[PDB]
Design a protein around this nucleic acid. Sequence first.
RNA 1: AGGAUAGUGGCCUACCAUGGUUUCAACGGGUAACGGGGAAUAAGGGUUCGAUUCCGGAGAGGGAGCCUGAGAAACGGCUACCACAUCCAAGGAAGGCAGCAGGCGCGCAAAUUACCCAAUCCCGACACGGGGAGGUAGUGACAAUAAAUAACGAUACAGGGCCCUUUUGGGUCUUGUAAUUGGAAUGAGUACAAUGUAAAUACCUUAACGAGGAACAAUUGGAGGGCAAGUCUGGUGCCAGCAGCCGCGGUAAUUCCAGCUCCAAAAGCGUAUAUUAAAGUUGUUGCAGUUAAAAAGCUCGUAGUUGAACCUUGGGCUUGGCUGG
Lengths: 259, 67, 143, 60, 178
Amino acid sequence: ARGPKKHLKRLAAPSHWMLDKLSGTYAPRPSAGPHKLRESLPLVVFLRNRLKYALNGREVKAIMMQQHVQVDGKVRTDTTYPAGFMDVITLEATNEHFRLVYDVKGKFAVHRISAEEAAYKLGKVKKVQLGKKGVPYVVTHDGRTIRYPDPLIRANDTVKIDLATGKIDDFIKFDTGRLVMVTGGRNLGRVGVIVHREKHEGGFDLVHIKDALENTFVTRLSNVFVIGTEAGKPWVSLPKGKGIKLSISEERDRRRAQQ
Amino acid sequence: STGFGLIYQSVADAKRFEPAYRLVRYGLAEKVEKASRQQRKQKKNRDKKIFGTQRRAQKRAARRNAD
Amino acid sequence: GKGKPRGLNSARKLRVHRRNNRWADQAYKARLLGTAFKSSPFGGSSHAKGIVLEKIGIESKQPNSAIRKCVRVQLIKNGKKVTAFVPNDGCLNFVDENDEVLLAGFGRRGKAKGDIPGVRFKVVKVSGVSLLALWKEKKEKPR
Amino acid sequence: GKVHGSLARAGKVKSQTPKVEKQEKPKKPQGRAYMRLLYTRRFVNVTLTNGKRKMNPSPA
Amino acid sequence: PRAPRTYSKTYSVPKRPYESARLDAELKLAGEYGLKNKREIYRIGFQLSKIRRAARDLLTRDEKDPKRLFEGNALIRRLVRIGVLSEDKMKLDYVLALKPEDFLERRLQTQVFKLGLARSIHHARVLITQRHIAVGKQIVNIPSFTVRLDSQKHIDFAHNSPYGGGRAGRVKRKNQGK
RNA sequence: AGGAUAGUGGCCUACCAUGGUUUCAACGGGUAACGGGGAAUAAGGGUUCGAUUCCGGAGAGGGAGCCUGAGAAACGGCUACCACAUCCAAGGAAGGCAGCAGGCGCGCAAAUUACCCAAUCCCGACACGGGGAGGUAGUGACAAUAAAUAACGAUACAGGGCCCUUUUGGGUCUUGUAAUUGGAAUGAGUACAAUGUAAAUACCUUAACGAGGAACAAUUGGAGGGCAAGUCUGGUGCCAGCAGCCGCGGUAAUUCCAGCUCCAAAAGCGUAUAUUAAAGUUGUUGCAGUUAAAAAGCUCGUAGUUGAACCUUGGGCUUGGCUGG
Ligand SMILES: [Mg+2]
Ligand SMILES: [Mg+2]
Ligand SMILES: [Mg+2]
Ligand SMILES: [Mg+2]
Ligand SMILES: [Mg+2]
Ligand SMILES: [Mg+2]
Ligand SMILES: [Mg+2]
Ligand SMILES: [Mg+2]
Ligand SMILES: [Mg+2]
Ligand SMILES: [Mg+2]
Ligand SMILES: [Mg+2]
Ligand SMILES: [Mg+2]
Ligand SMILES: [Mg+2]
Ligand SMILES: [Mg+2]
Ligand SMILES: [Mg+2]
Ligand SMILES: [Mg+2]
Ligand SMILES: [Mg+2]
Ligand SMILES: [Mg+2]
Ligand SMILES: [Mg+2]
Ligand SMILES: [Mg+2]
Ligand SMILES: [Mg+2]
Ligand SMILES: [Mg+2]
Ligand SMILES: [Mg+2]
Ligand SMILES: [Mg+2]
Ligand SMILES: [Mg+2]
Ligand SMILES: [Mg+2]
Ligand SMILES: [Mg+2]
Ligand SMILES: [Mg+2]
Ligand SMILES: [Mg+2]
Ligand SMILES: [Mg+2]
Ligand SMILES: [Mg+2]
Ligand SMILES: [Mg+2]
Ligand SMILES: [Mg+2]
Ligand SMILES: [Mg+2]
Ligand SMILES: [Mg+2]
Ligand SMILES: [Mg+2]
Ligand SMILES: [Mg+2]
Ligand SMILES: [Mg+2]
Ligand SMILES: [Mg+2]
Ligand SMILES: [Mg+2]
Ligand SMILES: [Mg+2]
Ligand SMILES: [Mg+2]
Ligand SMILES: [Mg+2]
Ligand SMILES: [Mg+2]
Ligand SMILES: [Mg+2]
Ligand SMILES: [Mg+2]
Ligand SMILES: [Mg+2]
Ligand SMILES: [Mg+2]
Ligand SMILES: [Mg+2]
Ligand SMILES: [Mg+2]
Ligand SMILES: [Mg+2]
Ligand SMILES: [Mg+2]
Ligand SMILES: [Mg+2]
Ligand SMILES: [Mg+2]
Ligand SMILES: [Mg+2]
């Protein structure tokens, strides 16, 4: 079509943004960045639709041009910057630190974290290979390139990013029993431990995951993010609900008792 | 009635982070006076037919019309 | 065995046979042959404008005896000539030669109705004014 | 078939029908009121004739 | 362009236009509830016709089925909430037994007349249309407003109505002011 | 094997083989054919539609060829040809609304040459500029939602309802009639004003004004049957006309033209065309084939469809979750 698209129709935007139909014709097209278009969250949605700090798109640009917003310890002024999973958003004017972790309903939760936890991040290792001059490097899920990793680190593992120097503190090998959040598919946002990894050469490997309520579901390996060394030991604070999916009848019962 | 309200820490802060039309409502600013959109667009497209300074363009146009 | 195949793998024979046999439905033939597009004076449209050629009058069918008062109209869109009935007591006097009339079908969907032979259309408007409005003196003919 | 005929008699009956003006009668109620009028006329003051019920009895 | 806005029809006409049994039943039913036209009867029949269809689908499912339990109880609760269904008939078999008079009982027009604020049902509609009746602290001028059980006790004259402690109306002010 | 391409590849060249598709329908033709998400109708199974709010594709009068660039065979870029077509001082020069609005033409068929970047977003060197993208209003009975056109009394007069009662005569409370009588209530409209908005309009609130024939006056179709509602009155007299169909009209026409009355739906109602159900009249569910339409004159026969029965059963032992009670 003669070139890259630059617009996003409101109806064609990702459903987890939870945008309304009648507010306009178009939706914010996420910029190119560390995270994929379908799996990202532009900062205009976060500051206006989620936090409701800004009343409109003019105000979110005013906020970021005064250098208030930091992502992963660096000031960002791109209103459509594609923030994604495990990214840290810092607003020192409001003294708030956020981490983008999926909630069990499939959306990006408003998950506040402590300043101590905001000093690092996790990244899923996509590939390990040799660069120029024979220097090995690791590519994380957010496009980071870390040189000289621990030689035991392999793909599908999770590394702990120092997030100020970009180096690797330590890692978690991908194996049975590791704590996992699902980052894709209809089981998105659920948290459980690996029960069984089913290999299919030339196809898609499948992972069997057990919920804390001993509910079992299957999802693709590309949707698997290792977040802990064992059950009940996540390396970051989990959002409210702890990633356990309840049926609608259970949710209705819980809502009846709460109110 | 139900509405929306903003209170700034100072008048200086308010004048910086407010839309122009609200300041005109409160008398803190004067409505900027500009020509209509048709006139601004027609003038922009008229200037597109001139390469260089307007003084050079009209002097050269004047020379052609020996009148 | 009811004279038709019943095997689980005989869908092609069943699909073709039904496809072949819907051609016996004359309603189906007209939809796919496009007979309204090709043969109908209106070309498949509900209405059509035209110019009045002459006031003539058609003798009714037995056992009735009357003069059905029609006009000869040449359609603007394709130049074809059709006969159009002028309904109501005395509405022929509202229609003059070389007037612009809006036509519509008689409602029998291409067949003649009643004792009127060979007429499948009726006059709706003349000179851009509804014939019903003229008949009930709601409006006057622009002339 | 054979098609022709004199056009002189067009509008004969309607032209010679004697014009009669409408009596300036009271307006009928509109909307909800008209449904109220019809309901009573058919279920409250029944005008039946020992099993012979007519909406528009001609005078006879 | 902008996303389309959804809309749908809220009624359906009968298949046979002329039938004395249906015409007489409707007029008898319209006269009882002071309805403006037959469309207000078609509307109740339309939404009741689709309530039965929903109930039939759940009744074909096995008992203790998750969809039947969740949506069946919610539909019953909703019908109980507006007072159409009695508290002792929450079985989804009495739902099929519902009748249009159950729905017409819960209209604002029916309750105003049945609460004694009006002499007749036709007085109720004009009181509602003329901004005299308020539910809670909100003026409601829609006769078809379906009264909930908890809203039933709060039907009274508007606080600014001539009949409910407000000022005198337009006509009275013209006479007593001369 | 090479060339070319960003790259695979008969994509092209040289040389060499004779292969490739097809009754399981190739190839060709038509399409009143852009595909899909979807739309109408729908017991089930289905039938019809999808130019059109989103996605993908294609095009910018018709072809073809290119420059720049990461990205275009771009057309609000260029080059050339074809058809239209503009100015000209006659030497020359300049075009592309299937962008917004608008005009002509075409037609049964579709709105303003309006305001603005305030919202939604996009672009740029960018907190600032630009955006007929987009939003606002105008026209707008495309469709859709709710919903006015009156309500309540008082007297009169009638009947029922009861009661004082044997009926009689009344007391009296529920209906119907009132050119037969009131005082209340309100928004359609208008309007100070505030709200609304970028600014307005409108909406929403709301002073004052704003309803008796409440002329602030509901219409569209019908009244033989189908099909609900006239054997009323006048006119015509196989004429005029009505009539989807059956039928009506020749001197009291239940059908025409009218008046009265009545019926149906109502801010909507009628007409034409298409389509869906009704249609078990396309039938897989689920038609028919002696005589209503319909077994090839008779055998053979390829593809197609369809093809007899039969191979670990029974028994025993423990074993968890559920569900009467
Ligand atoms: Mg990246
Ligand atoms: Mg980053
Ligand atoms: Mg300039
Ligand atoms: Mg310039
Ligand atoms: Mg058909
Ligand atoms: Mg001829
Ligand atoms: Mg015309
Ligand atoms: Mg009836
Ligand atoms: Mg090669
Ligand atoms: Mg190649
Ligand atoms: Mg199609
Ligand atoms: Mg086409
Ligand atoms: Mg489509
Ligand atoms: Mg389409
Ligand atoms: Mg077309
Ligand atoms: Mg459309
Ligand atoms: Mg498109
Ligand atoms: Mg063109
Ligand atoms: Mg460029
Ligand atoms: Mg193109
Ligand atoms: Mg373009
Ligand atoms: Mg081009
Ligand atoms: Mg253009
Ligand atoms: Mg245009
Ligand atoms: Mg139109
Ligand atoms: Mg126009
Ligand atoms: Mg803008
Ligand atoms: Mg526009
Ligand atoms: Mg608007
Ligand atoms: Mg009116
Ligand atoms: Mg007004
Ligand atoms: Mg006004
Ligand atoms: Mg203002
Ligand atoms: Mg009428
Ligand atoms: Mg009839
Ligand atoms: Mg009848
Ligand atoms: Mg009779
Ligand atoms: Mg019929
Ligand atoms: Mg006579
Ligand atoms: Mg007579
Ligand atoms: Mg007569
Ligand atoms: Mg009769
Ligand atoms: Mg008739
Ligand atoms: Mg008549
Ligand atoms: Mg009605
Ligand atoms: Mg069917
Ligand atoms: Mg059926
Ligand atoms: Mg049949
Ligand atoms: Mg048959
Ligand atoms: Mg048969
Ligand atoms: Mg048959
Ligand atoms: Mg025979
Ligand atoms: Mg034989
Ligand atoms: Mg023969
Ligand atoms: Mg076998």
